[PDB]
Design a protein around this nucleic acid. Sequence first.
RNA 1: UCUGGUGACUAUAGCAAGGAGGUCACACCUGUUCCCAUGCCGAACACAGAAGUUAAGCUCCUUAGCGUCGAUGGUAGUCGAACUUACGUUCCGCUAGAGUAGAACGUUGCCAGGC
RNA 2: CUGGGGCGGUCGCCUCCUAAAAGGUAACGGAGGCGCUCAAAGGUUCCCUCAGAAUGGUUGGAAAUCAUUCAUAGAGUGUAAAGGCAUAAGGGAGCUUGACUGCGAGACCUACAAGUCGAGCAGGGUCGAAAGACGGACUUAGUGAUCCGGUGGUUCCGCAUGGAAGGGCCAUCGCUCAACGGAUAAAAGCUACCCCGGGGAUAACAGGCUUAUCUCCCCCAAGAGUUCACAUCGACGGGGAGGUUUGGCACCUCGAUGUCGGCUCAUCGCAUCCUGGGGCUGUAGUCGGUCCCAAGGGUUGGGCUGUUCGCCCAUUAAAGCGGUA
RNA 3: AAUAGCUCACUAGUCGAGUGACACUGCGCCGAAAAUGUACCGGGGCUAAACAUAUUACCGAAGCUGUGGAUUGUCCUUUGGA
RNA 4: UAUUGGAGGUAGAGCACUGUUUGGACGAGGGGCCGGUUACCGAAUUCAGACAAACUCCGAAUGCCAAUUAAUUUAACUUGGGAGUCAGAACAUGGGUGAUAAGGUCCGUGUUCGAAAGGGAAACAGCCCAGACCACCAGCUAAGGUCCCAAAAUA
RNA 5: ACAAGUAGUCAGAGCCCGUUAAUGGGUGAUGGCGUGCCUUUUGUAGAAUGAACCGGCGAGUUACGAUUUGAUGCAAGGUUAA
Lengths: 137, 82, 58
Amino acid sequence: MLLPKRVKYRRQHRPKTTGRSKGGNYVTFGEFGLQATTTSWITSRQIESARIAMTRYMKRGGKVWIKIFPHTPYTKKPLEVRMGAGKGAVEGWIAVVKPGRILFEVAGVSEEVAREALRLASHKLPVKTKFVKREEL
Amino acid sequence: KKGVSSTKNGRDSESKRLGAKRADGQFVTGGSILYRQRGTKIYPGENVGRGGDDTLFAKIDGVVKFERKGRDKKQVSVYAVA
Amino acid sequence: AKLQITLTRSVIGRPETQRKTVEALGLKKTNSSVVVEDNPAIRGQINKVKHLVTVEEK
RNA sequence: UCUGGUGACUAUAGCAAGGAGGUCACACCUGUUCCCAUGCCGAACACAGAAGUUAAGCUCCUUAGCGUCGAUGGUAGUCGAACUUACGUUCCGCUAGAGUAGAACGUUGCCAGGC
RNA sequence: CUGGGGCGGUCGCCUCCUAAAAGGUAACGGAGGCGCUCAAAGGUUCCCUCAGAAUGGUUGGAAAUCAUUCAUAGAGUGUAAAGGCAUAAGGGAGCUUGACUGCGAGACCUACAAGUCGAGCAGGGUCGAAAGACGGACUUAGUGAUCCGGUGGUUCCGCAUGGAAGGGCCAUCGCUCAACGGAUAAAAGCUACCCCGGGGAUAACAGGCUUAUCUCCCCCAAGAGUUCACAUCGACGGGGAGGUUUGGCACCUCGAUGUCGGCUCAUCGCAUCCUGGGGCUGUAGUCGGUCCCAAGGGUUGGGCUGUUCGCCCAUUAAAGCGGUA
RNA sequence: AAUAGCUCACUAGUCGAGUGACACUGCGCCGAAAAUGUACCGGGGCUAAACAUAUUACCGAAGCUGUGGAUUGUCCUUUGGA
RNA sequence: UAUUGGAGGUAGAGCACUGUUUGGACGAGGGGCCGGUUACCGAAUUCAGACAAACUCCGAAUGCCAAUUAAUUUAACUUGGGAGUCAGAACAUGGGUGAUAAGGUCCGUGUUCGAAAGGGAAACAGCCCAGACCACCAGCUAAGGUCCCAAAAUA
RNA sequence: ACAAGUAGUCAGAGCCCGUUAAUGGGUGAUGGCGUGCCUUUUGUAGAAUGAACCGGCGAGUUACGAUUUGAUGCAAGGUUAA
Ligand SMILES: [Mg+2]
Ligand SMILES: [Mg+2]
Ligand SMILES: [Mg+2]
Ligand SMILES: [Mg+2]
Ligand SMILES: [Mg+2]
């Protein structure tokens, strides 16, 4: 869950960060889930930090599903350059999120362990989150 | 002003004022272009012709009416009563 | 039947659309007024610029 | 409404399946001598003929598997307004896409023989 | 042209996106092409339908060709891209030259010059049995006014007349102007010896905004540290404050705002170097480390460099960090 | 350094009423350090003189009315009023 | 403006195409070996998920073009004489660029300032309200307000 | 002679005077409002430029020709130049 293997157009217009989650608002694979309540970017490197924390905290226990994939590339201009002269080069890959977009899913592990793991993941992550269970009823 | 950094994409053509040129209901004289296009976004219908440039022009005088052909194609017509 | 229109709010700072609508209703200056006959054509214009005018059943 | 032409409609018209039927119309069929016939077959195309047979194409009837169509309610979005500097809030029209109920195994014009 | 010049890049045309569902719309914004090619890859008449996939096989690099049911065109369309295309605009095949001459009601575009599309009407064709179709290539790039000069037609001009030399008109060619509306279609550099006219329309200094960089603070807590996240230190990540650095912007100042170090004189903040009060500790006290309260005062003399800085030699309780053009 | 283990698993009984958790919210708290002088309400000051939801007054402009006056335009002639 | 008729593919959605992607079925190719087995790995085929300026089976709001036509308004075009303008600015909103930086830069769409006095925002070209013909020691209000500075509720 | 001043305006007591007699002249305690003018600019109280102060002088004119408007002759004609 790091980078797209290939993209057609490598320099792209930045994403819209205003509105609500187009989809992925439900726990489908796992049992418990973690959704977001604000809307920032995710940079293919903070989710890496988060899945490590969760996985290593479960001690290779139950399964994990990352629901957010970093698709959008972003650019940064070289240091101390003036304005103009083209667009800069790719610095990282991102995936915008929206309030209500589930991010991580877990199953095959007790409820309290899952809540603790998703808590520890939440702090390595730049968006306010919430703990959710597989919606039923 | 920066320095040597340069881009390989600063080029474009002049847009061609295509699209519609008359609306349903107005009196067009014969020859009036109704819809400059490429390929066939709209086929000619009754009393309407196809130019070499896929342009659509009325054959005769009359009113203009856009209509449906089949499921996913549109034509144009001209009717003379005025 | 008959309704009376008064331009309570001003017209400064509003788009040319709302300026031309107010002109069409025949209202000249702030707090000017007119009496016209109830008519869906006129109601269309009042509704478009209701936030600048007010209506009465006179 | 049969039957065959012909053409009008957004596949509510189609595909698949099962089942009939050949009412003299329809295809199947016998052959290449005959015009013709094919970069390369009587395959087709054309042609002379009608002894075989509905088996298939065709026709009619079923069935929603399959195709298409598809509301109401809503939600997203947004025109105008009033707050406002919030990855905003409120009000008023308009109002999707997706999905769900459902429609649906066509309607139909002129002509010629039918009955 | 230029987020100041310079250096680099670019300059005309076509296609796409940015472009906010008519049209139009900018940046040294994001992607690519053109300066051609076709006597069939043109016209017309008649025919035909594709890529791939398996049920597969003489070859089988796999799939060459061949076979059979599905293949919505996933293929082809001379080329870039986008619109189109089974009416086929795709593929054959037969005739053929309309890749005609004279024109054009009408519209599109548009400052102009240009550019674009045209029903129809004559002449004379070619194809087709005829109806009809044909003034080039499925559409959109493949180019360059005007003066000058060359070649062929036509004289209708041609100085007192006849004829000619020269012109005119009609074809067409020929610069090559790519800085592609083309300053003569002849031409590069240094000025720290510079000068004049201008500009904060535009840079160097600081002032201002921003805070990428920069200094500091925090949050989570894998971990190291016998054991132990949390004496101390804290990875991966995440959130901030400040306006002291390197920058970005070009807003005041070019009818002048002296710019670096040092000297004299300071003044203010506290994220405190010493001194005062404390919590602690992996603190027995001296020791040190950490954090908190604290800005009252204090916070050296030299060697080396113009140096700020930094290193070094001696001390001190300490030899603090910054603002102040 | 073996360990020394009372108390909130647990309630009669000290005695007698209550007591874990959960959501979704309205308003605050901490995080919160900068340079001449308060100095991040304009000042005083405010526990409403803050905030929310209603309701009723009033102030507030060279806006708009009232009276008088220019100067042009369009109408009625009301050759005057509009 | 009300009512009809229409072109177009943005917001939003969606994955049917070009791609970009996360899990789970399911048989199988080079190949672990002797053509091989099994793991797999390159895909075929499915089920559930998602992402897109240069993706679209779909698809608004609004804008635009025009009408047999209405209703209210008062411009509009043609020709001629005379010009000035080619340094814009900030706010709000849709986008590019930058760093979802700038009182940045480049476009679109309003408004205002420019060329606009007056009231509010302490002061403060661009914000809010509102356009000053000239009196008046008259009256009503908009934005903002009503304990004092300082007109109005210690409602 | 307790005061914070782009020097005015507006409101006004007190004190002197009496005209181009008219709802009068001089000064002004105290209150309200209020950062010169030009140029140049997107924007200037500007710490952008210009002027110490007074006075005088100091910048779209004339000739010829073209065009257009008004005016006046008179009109299928009008008109002269040397
Ligand atoms: Mg000079
Ligand atoms: Mg000076
Ligand atoms: Mg001055
Ligand atoms: Mg001064
Ligand atoms: Mg001077």
